[PDB]
């Protein structure tokens, strides 16, 4: 067979430097273990400094912090500060009461 | 001797399903691999049973005739092998592989 | 910022059932493929010849192959050895 699963091969980006270890399975496993959604902050409005309570009439943004059934995600999952989690949950509950979410 | 080893290698089943009393619930019929010594035992017993249906008073003669027919293609024990392999193909998913 | 959770002092640092990687038996996988090969192309089909030949060699002497079927975890040995050093406990 001339095919390998993507999970068993690492694609080295262009312009990056590499070591021989980057072709091993240890690199594959190490990349899975340390795979965190750290790029969310730059794409996370609520981790930017905006007040989540100003989005109570924008269900599309709020729908990014609820599960498929509408259950607000725990702070352990959203990664927000206590204040933003508190404000975001209020926004979602207000949005639900208005008839938008 | 070469005829005997060829007949034993063609008649013996490669695998056989065995019932394991694992759990209080019903036992599981899982295919199991067989080694060459275990394969020869299964095929030999089939040959002996087939041989003892022949007319000769001498076991050597009945065995000789049975071995000659098997070396010439005709044997009723090939059906037994096909039925043991059919069961194992059915229970292929029951295998554990760990 | 990621919340660090610090444990209280503990009588021990131990994993109840350390996970171990049990590599799959080579003879069992060979048998699982041959059985599948017979399921598609048919029993005794000439397409599964190589599978039959390989299975016979794998199981010739031992039905589960000659493998080092022994693997144990050492996490509990190291955890008990290093706990007092790394727990960050205040001085006496």
């Amino acid at each position: 067979t001339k095919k390998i699963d993507q999970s068993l091969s690492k694609k080295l980006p262009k312009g990056t430097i590499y070591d021989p270890f980057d072709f091993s399975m240890g690199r594959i496993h190490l990349d899975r273990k340390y795979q965190a959604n750290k790029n969310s902050n730059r794409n996370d409005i609520m981790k930017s400094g905006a007040n989540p309570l100003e989005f109570y009439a924008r269900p599309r943004i709020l729908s990014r912090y609820v599960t498929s059934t509408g259950r607000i995600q725990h702070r352990d999952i959203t990664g927000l500060s206590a204040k933003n989690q508190r404000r975001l949950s209020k926004a979602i509950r207000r949005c639900q009461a208005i008839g938008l979410m | 001797i070469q005829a005997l080893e060829k007949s034993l290698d063609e008649l013996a089943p490669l695998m056989m399903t065995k019932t394991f009393n694992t759990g209080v619930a019903k036992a599981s019929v899982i295919p199991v691999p067989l080694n060459k010594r275990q394969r020869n035992r299964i095929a030999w017993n089939w040959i002996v049973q087939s041989a003892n249906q022949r007319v000769s008073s001498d076991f050597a003669v009945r065995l000789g005739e049975e071995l000659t027919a098997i070396a010439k293609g005709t044997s009723s024990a090939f059906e037994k092998r096909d039925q043991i392999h059919k069961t194992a193909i059915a229970h292929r998913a029951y295998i554990q592989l760990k | 910022k990621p919340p660090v959770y610090r444990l209280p002092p503990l009588p021990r640092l131990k994993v109840k059932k350390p996970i171990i990687r049990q590599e799959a038996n080579k003879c069992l996988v060979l048998m699982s493929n041959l059985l599948q090969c017979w399921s598609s192309y048919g029993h005794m089909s000439p397409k599964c010849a190589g599978l039959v030949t390989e299975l016979k060699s794998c199981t010739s002497e031992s039905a589960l192959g000659k493998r080092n079927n022994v693997q144990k975890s050492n996490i509990n040995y190291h955890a008990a050895r290093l706990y007092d050093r790394i727990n960050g406990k205040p001085h006496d």
Binding site: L8, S9, F21, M25 | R92, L97 | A24, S32, Q36
Partner: peptide
């Protein structure tokens, strides 16, 4: 790099065969 890529070849083949058997289930 060859020394590493040789061990990686073996494991890939092994793990692309356990998947085939496990997936067959």
């Amino acid at each position: 790099e060859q020394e590493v890529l040789d061990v990686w070849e073996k494991k890939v083949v092994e793990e692309t065969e356990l998947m085939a058997a496990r997936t067959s289930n």
